[PDB]
Write a protein that binds this ligand. Structure first.
Ligand SMILES: CCCCCC/C=C/CCCCCCCC(=O)O
Length: 153
């Protein structure tokens, strides 16, 4: 679904550094690719890093990525495949998660992505996520969690 994005939310330099787990998406992508771990390093206001994942069809994958950041949006570039390469806008910022939205080739009608600091986010985090989504005209009921990993949601 299309969000109502907040036009006053901008990415703070270095906010994306470190390890993240992409555990909730809309539409649900987890039958195609799952157990997504991201690691980002700062390059000025940009980032470089890696994304590792499990694919039922391709096996274990490791990808090198770049993020170029421009205000409330960034461009995501991956080396080997470009299924998820797109501009993504920030929808919500929290100490424990970020919510992004874009229209990549893999989900060209729109893809909302929730990146968590914790590998298995607990109920208090999910409650905050639900409120963040409502604030941008989205709804957790249209999202799927990654139930391929050792986490109950
Ligand atoms: C928390 C910082 C997030 C910044 C990046 C926002 C967009 C991310 C897109 C991630 C794509 C997920 C790739 C899945 C693995 C694959 O199929 O290659």
């Amino acid at each position: 679904k299309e969000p109502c994005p907040p036009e006053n939310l901008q990415l703070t330099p270095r906010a994306l550094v470190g390890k993240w787990y992409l555990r909730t998406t809309s539409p649900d992508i987890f039958k195609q690719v799952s157990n997504i771990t991201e690691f980002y390093s700062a390059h000025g206001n940009d980032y470089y890093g890696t994304v590792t994942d499990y694919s039922p069809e391709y096996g274990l994958e490791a990808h090198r990525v770049n993020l170029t950041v421009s205000g409330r949006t960034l461009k995501f570039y991956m080396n080997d495949t470009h299924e998820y390469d797109s501009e993504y806008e920030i929808l919500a910022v929290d100490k424990d998660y970020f919510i992004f939205y874009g229209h990549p080739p893999a989900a060209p009608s729109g893809l909302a992505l929730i990146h968590y600091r914790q590998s298995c986010p607990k109920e208090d985090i999910i409650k905050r996520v639900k409120k963040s989504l409502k604030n941008v005209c989205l709804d957790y009921k249209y999202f799927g969690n990654d139930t391929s990993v050792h986490c109950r949601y």
